[PDB]
Amino acid sequence: SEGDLDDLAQDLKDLYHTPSFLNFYPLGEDIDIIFNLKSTFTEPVLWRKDQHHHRVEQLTLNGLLQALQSPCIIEGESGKGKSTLLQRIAMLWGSGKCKALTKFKFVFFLRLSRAQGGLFETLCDQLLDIPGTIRKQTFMAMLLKLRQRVLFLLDGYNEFKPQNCPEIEALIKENHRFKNMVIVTTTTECLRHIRQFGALTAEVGDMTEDSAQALIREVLIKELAEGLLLQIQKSRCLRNLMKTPLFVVITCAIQMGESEFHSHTQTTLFHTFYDLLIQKNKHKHKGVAASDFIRSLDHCGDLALEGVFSHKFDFELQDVSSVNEDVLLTTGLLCKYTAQRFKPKYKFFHKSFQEYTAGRRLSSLLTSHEPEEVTKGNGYLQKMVSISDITSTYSSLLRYTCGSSVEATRAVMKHL
Amino acid sequence: SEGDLDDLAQDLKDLYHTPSFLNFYPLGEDIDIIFNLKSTFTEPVLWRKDQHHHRVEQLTLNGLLQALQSPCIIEGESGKGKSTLLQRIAMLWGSGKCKALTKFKFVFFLRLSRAQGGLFETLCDQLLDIPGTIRKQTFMAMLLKLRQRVLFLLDGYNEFKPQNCPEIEALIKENHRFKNMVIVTTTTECLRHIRQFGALTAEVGDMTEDSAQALIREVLIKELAEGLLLQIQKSRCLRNLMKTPLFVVITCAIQMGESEFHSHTQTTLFHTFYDLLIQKNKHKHKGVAASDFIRSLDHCGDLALEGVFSHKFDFELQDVSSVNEDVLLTTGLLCKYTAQRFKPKYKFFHKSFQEYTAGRRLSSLLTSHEPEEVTKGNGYLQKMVSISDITSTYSSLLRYTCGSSVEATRAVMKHL
């Protein structure tokens, strides 16, 4: 019973070249845009983390793969786009081009969030239907005897509920009972459930200038691609924003379908980003009252606005003081960091995002029909009385506030 | 056993030459008109789609068949007449004339909308009754061992309810298990349920001048055929409309049964088409109240009319703002497009159809017994006060309005 093992290895190699594996939805299934893994994010950068949990050594794919350890934990950037890294590893093995992966007899790419019933059942139904020849639980014996010649690539750990498949939870933590190699991807918020068991950790970095331009050029009609690439080259700000995958994909998604180039000022870009963030997690916000959800978002809004005036970007628990923040963290407006820290820290996705949020909130206050809200809005606007702050500290805030409406602009321009 | 496989191949070849397969109803079974696949639409053209969902490289049948990939998705133009393409493939194989198809041992033409109970059961009852000599589920083992020497042609995907036959849904999406070739035909509206899994995609194009004339000549008594061909040659408008199959077959259907040639002004042609759309799908409009169906049609009518005045043919969701629009999408008045775009768009079947729709609505308003509706009708008519618009922009609108009613004509002519 050896011939069928070679067949399994070959079928997996061919499986990882199929469109059903290579095609994915970068903004989620709700938006029907499909990228082909083959010509998209093909040049990732990974930072290694040391005992102090900071970044050391810039590593790249096909570099890290030459120095894999017992279970490796790769942390998503901050919960940005899809961590299309494990898929790239499986693809390279299937192509047989990366020397580092030639030692592996099998590579099993699994979506852990859908695992249930046991490891063998997960493999049988989720990947390749295993021939009855050896479908007698002797497969597991083969893997144990085989040792570290197989990779289990487990995506979506943060979405995994271990009660559904204790066998895999054991594989991730109790690796000494399997004697094989595992790579798991997670998010910052759920890192605490693991990490302890990692032999090597890595963080996904941002995009390079060449990667971002290549992604735009190859996934957008030439005329719009040239328009966008030119605008990025002209702007001294976009080139710094176009490092974050989501802000590279969104700027294309909003242009596809058009027959002409549109500038799409960053204010609209941040607005689009915001709506995607608020709505994509809406499917999990059914657990709270709609009024509680809005109150939480408004609270976050005021937090950002006060933060801008106080030059504060790093928040502690007592600065939020809301048990209902769980929906806010689910939403993803704030990221909760719990590394080598006595007290948890809360941060906004990006400093420019915090400024946007503050702007949106101020704009809303200044246009409210309720005089109490308008007064509060004016209370903040009335601080814009010094040129050294107007053209500096609050430059972003004023731009985002004005770009969010018409009436808000009147209020701001009259003051200025 | 090998002799039984040969008998099946031969029986299928002969099956596809049988009138029960070749004869079809181009306007649906409700209208008792039968076309013979052998002499009708014999020269289709297909457009290959690129990664941007744009049309490139016009292909022909017996061309595309030389470059087939794992499961191929062919999209109907917009939901027109029967997509008699897969049947042509079955014939070409059965006749043994197309070299590209000579490699196939079996070709299975299935009407997916009528599948249930499993793939083997569907094949046994829908096509050729498989002899009891090999009807032991060993047929599937044969197909798996045989590999890509068979074609599954699955028509009517948009009408398929996968819960009835998970085996075929698997065949369409999970083809890594089957290792055979599948061609699926679908519609724009249901494309989003697939595509990701497609290796190659194509769009069905329009008719050539020679094809349309051949279709008229061979399916209409000589005297009427000559009359129609001459009228098309004289006019400067029909020749552009006679590219859409629906407007080639309808113009014949309304003449067959007559003993003389009638001009049948294109206003009546568009009327006939409109009436068919709201009736052929009537069988699926039983899920709404009668008053809601009419309100949706009136809403669509006003949408078209405003669009004519605003030069707007491309609508978004917020321009309709009605959850009940599903009945219009079911009807086929509006087509929903979900390509590589951030937001969905809605379009009318054809710009000339939108103009007709607007005309029909304006005509109705101008003849209503309710003075409020008449006022609205006049509100639009009162804009026809500039010669540069009267003989241009609104030329079609005025013609369709007048040709829809005598009373509407009086209102229009008095104004002009």
Residue numbers in the entry:
A (entry chain A), B (entry chain B): 94 to 509
In the authors' words:
With a total of 108,418 cryo-EM images, two stable classes of disk-like particles were isolated and further refined by imposing C11, or C12 symmetry, respectively. With the 11-mer particles, the CARD domain density was slightly improved from the refinement without imposing symmetry. The C11 and C12 particles were subjected to symmetry expansion and followed by local refinements focusing on three successive protomers (tri-protomer). Both tri-protomers were modeled as only containing huNLRC4. The huNLRC4/huNLRC4 interfaces contain several conserved residues and intermolecular salt bridge pairs. Compared to mNLRC4, huNLRC4 has two additional salt bridge pairs (Asp104–Lys272 and Asp222–Arg270), while both the Asp at positions 104 and 222 are Asn residues in mNLRC4. Noteworthily, the Phe435 from the activated protomer is positioned in a well-defined hydrophobic pocket in the receptor protomer. This pocket contains several conserved residues (Ile124, Ile126, Ala346, Met349, Thr365 and Leu369) from both the NBD and WHD subdomains undergoing large conformational changes during activation. Interestingly, this pocket exists only in the activated open huNLRC4 and is partially formed in the closed model.
The NLR family caspase activation and recruitment domain-containing 4 (NLRC4) inflammasome is a critical cytosolic innate immune machine formed upon the direct sensing of bacterial infection and in response to cell stress during sterile chronic inflammation. After sensing cellular cues, NLRs (including the NLR family caspase activation and recruitment domain (CARD) domain-containing 4, NLRC4) assemble into a molecular scaffold that recruits and processes inflammatory caspases (including caspase-1) by a close-proximity mechanism, forming the so-called inflammasome cßomplexes. Here we identify Bacillus thailandensis type III secretion system needle protein (Needle) as a potent trigger of the human NLR family apoptosis inhibitory protein (NAIP)/NLRC4 inflammasome complex formation and determine its structural features by cryogenic electron microscopy. We also provide a detailed understanding of how type III secretion system pathogen components are sensed by human NAIP to form a cascade of NLRC4 protomer through a critical lasso-like motif, a ‘lock–key’ activation model and large structural rearrangement, ultimately forming the full human NLRC4 inflammasome.
